[PDB]
């Protein structure tokens, strides 16, 4: 019933600056008000729009009463501006960062990375988007009318207490299984409707849940055409009937909109501890798409981009990352995250093979590496699915072993280290994270 909220597409001003204010306010869910946090607003955040090769400065004002950090998930930027747990912005503080984007068009995102409290700060409402454009993507005639036929879809669950407030506590169960709830939000709204031009509709999907994996489909089983993953366009669209999306992952899809029939985007029950409990025991509506008769702008191209050949593996450095959960201690290579002790020093500008194992438990670990867009060689036992075979910043690890081919183009010293971690936020917050350096 409510219309789908559309994050503002925020570009630079004449001074080449973008302002983000982090703050607390109020939102309403099912007629009950709650304290929430947002960037440039009460909840969630804008879509920061960047152009490849054009530097911008982002002025970040922390108007929370606790410290936070601002991490650009998916961006290939130096450790200095990565906004991992060392990137502290004190209460009432200001921090400016220069972003010099040098990667292909993609939908990335941004969120807090406060040490030990990333889950709570995301749960409270902090997340925004990053839209990177380049000259290539603009030649494709994709749907491009922001908030009309090019729509961000940030999907998140929340657990609310009886008083209507967000209920987040990092207790033993929450630390093991993750924070999840029985209420689904779509750009902050409960089961919103979106009026979409007849023709093609582009959805920029973000699984912004702390712990819940998702599996997108349409209520009448019309296909979704995947055109992009975390790190940008696929070579060609990949038609799917369902689309699993792990925590922190993005996919852009095209879906057909026919004059007549409204339909829902839905999420299908998943096989994951906690997540099949009602109301997620059956297909669960995410949003209603309402066909309208206004001008469309784009269509589905036969070809999207050119992906590089995977290079020969001979002579590449191999790094092994063993994930574990010992009682209440979550760790990598037998170590809970130590912010003053990067685990290893990666080379800058050199392909490496990273092998990440979840052998020893059956929990779901979407493993995310900062500072890169990588290629998955093996995902949890098999070469990746076609729509997952392009540029990724996350790889599934669940009771098996994954292998990714990674290259870091920017420096990250000990004082501003890159993170590699499980993006089940409660696992990260209780130790399933390492720091690593790149270059000097």
Stretch that binds Cu ion, among 54-62, 72-80, 166-174, 304-312 (CB under 5 A): 72-80
Is residue 71 a known part of a binding site? Answer: yes
3-state secondary structure of 10: strand
- Report the relative pairing of strands 317-326 and 284-292 from DSSP bridges: unpaired
CA–CA separation, 275 and 269 (whole Å): 8
Q: What is the DSSP letter of 427?
A: H
Omega prior to 279 cis, within 30 of 0:
yes
CA distances, 371 to each of 2, 74, 394, 417 (Å): 37, 7, 12, 10
- State which of residues 217, 427, 436, 438 lies at the interface with Cu ion (CB under 5 A): 427
Residue 384: both structure tokens together: 């990746």
- Report the relative pairing of strands 199-207 and 150-158 from DSSP bridges: parallel
CA distances, 296 to each of 150, 260, 300 (Å): 10, 16, 12
Supply the minimum distance, in Å, between the C-beta of residue 289 and Cu ion: 30
The percent helix, strand, coil of the chain (3-state, each to 5) is 5, 45, 50
Residue 17: both structure tokens together: 């600056």
Is residue 365 a known part of a binding site? Answer: yes
Closer of 40 and 394 to Cu ion (Cβ): 394
- State which of residues 246, 300, 417, 422 lies at the interface with Cu ion (CB under 5 A): 422
Q: Which helix H or strand E contains 420, and what residues bound it? A: strand 418-422
Is residue 284 a known part of a binding site? Answer: no
410 binds Cu ion (CB under 5 A): no
Supply the minimum distance, in Å, between the C-beta of residue 324 and Cu ion: 10
Is residue 368 a known part of a binding site? Answer: yes
Closer of 73 and 158 to Cu ion (Cβ): 73
Closer of 40 and 324 to Cu ion (Cβ): 324
Q: Which helix H or strand E contains 33, and what residues bound it? A: strand 32-39
Closer of 176 and 184 to Cu ion (Cβ): 176
Closer of 264 and 428 to Cu ion (Cβ): 428
Stretch that binds Cu ion, among 38-46, 139-147, 158-166, 426-434 (CB under 5 A): 426-434
Q: Which helix H or strand E contains 34, and what residues bound it? A: strand 32-39
Q: What is the DSSP letter of 89?
A: B
Closer of 105 and 177 to Cu ion (Cβ): 177
Supply the minimum distance, in Å, between the C-beta of residue 274 and Cu ion: 13
230 conformational bin, left if phi > 0, alpha if psi -120 to 50, beta if neither: alpha
CA–CA separation, 440 and 38 (whole Å): 35
Is residue 111 a known part of a binding site? Answer: yes
Closer of 224 and 419 to Cu ion (Cβ): 419
Residues 346-405 that bind Cu ion (CB under 5 A): 365, 370
89 binds Cu ion (CB under 5 A): no
73 binds Cu ion (CB under 5 A): yes
CA–CA separation, 404 and 374 (whole Å): 7
Site size toward Cu ion (CB under 5 A) is 6
Supply the minimum distance, in Å, between the C-beta of residue 53 and Cu ion: 21
424 binds Cu ion (CB under 5 A): yes
175 binds Cu ion (CB under 5 A): no
Supply the minimum distance, in Å, between the C-beta of residue 282 and Cu ion: 26
Is residue 73 a known part of a binding site? Answer: yes
113 binds Cu ion (CB under 5 A): no
Query: What are the residues binding Cu ion (CB under 5 A)?
Result: 73, 365, 370, 422, 424, 427
Return binding residues for Cu cation.
Answer: 71, 73, 111, 113, 365, 368, 370, 421-423, 427
């Amino acid at each position: 019933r409510p219309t789908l909220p559309i994050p503002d597409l925020l570009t630079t001003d004449a001074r080449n600056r973008i302002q983000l204010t982090i703050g607390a306010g109020q939102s309403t869910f099912g007629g009950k008000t709650a304290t929430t946090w947002g960037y440039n607003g009460n909840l969630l955040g804008p879509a920061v729009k960047l152009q490849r090769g054009k530097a911008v400065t982002v002025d970040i004002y922390n108007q929370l009463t606790e410290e936070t950090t601002l991490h650009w998930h998916g961006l290939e930027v130096p450790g200095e501006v990565d906004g991992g747990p060392q990137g502290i912005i004190p209460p009432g503080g200001k921090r400016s960062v220069t972003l010099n984007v040098d990667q292909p068009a993609a939908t990335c995102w941004f969120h807090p990375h406060q040490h030990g409290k990333t889950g709570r700060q995301v749960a409270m409402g902090l997340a925004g988007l990053v839209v990177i454009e380049d000259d290539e993507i603009l030649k494709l005639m994709l749907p491009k009318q922001w908030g009309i036929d090019d729509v961000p879809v940030i999907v998140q669950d929340k657990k609310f207490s009886a008083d209507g407030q967000i209920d987040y506590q990092l207790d033993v169960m929450t630390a093991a299984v993750g924070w999840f709830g029985d209420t689904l939000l779509t750009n902050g709204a409960i089961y919103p409707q979106h009026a979409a031009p007849r023709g093609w509709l582009r959805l920029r999907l973000l699984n912004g849940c702390n712990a819940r994996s998702l599996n997108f489909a349409t209520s009448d089983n019309r296909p979704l055409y995947v055109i992009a993953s975390d790190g940008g366009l696929l070579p060609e669209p990949v038609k799917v009937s369902e689309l699993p999306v792990l925590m922190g992952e993005r996919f852009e899809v095209l879906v057909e909109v026919n004059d007549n029939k409204p339909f829902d985007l839905v999420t299908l029950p998943v096989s994951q501890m906690g997540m099949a409990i009602a109301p997620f025991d059956k297909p669960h509506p995410v949003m209603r798409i309402q066909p309208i008769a206004i001008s469309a702008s784009g269509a589905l191209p036969d070809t999207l981009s050119s992906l590089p050949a995977l290079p020969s593996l001979e002579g590449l450095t191999v790094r092994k990352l063993q994930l574990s959960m010992d009682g209440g201690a979550n760790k990598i290579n037998g170590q809970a995250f130590d912010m003053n002790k990067p685990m290893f020093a990666a080379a800058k500008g050199q392909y490496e093979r990273w092998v990440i194992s979840g052998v020893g438990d059956m929990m779901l670990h979407p493993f995310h590496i900062h500072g890169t867009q990588f290629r998955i060689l093996s995902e949890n036992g098999k070469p990746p699915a076609a729509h997952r075979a392009g540029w990724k910043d996350t790889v599934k690890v669940e009771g098996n072993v994954s292998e990714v081919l990674v290259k870091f183009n920017h420096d990250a010293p000990k004082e501003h280290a890159y993170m590699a971690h499980c993006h089940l936020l409660e696992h990260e917050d209780t130790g399933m994270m390492l720091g690593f350096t790149v270059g000097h």
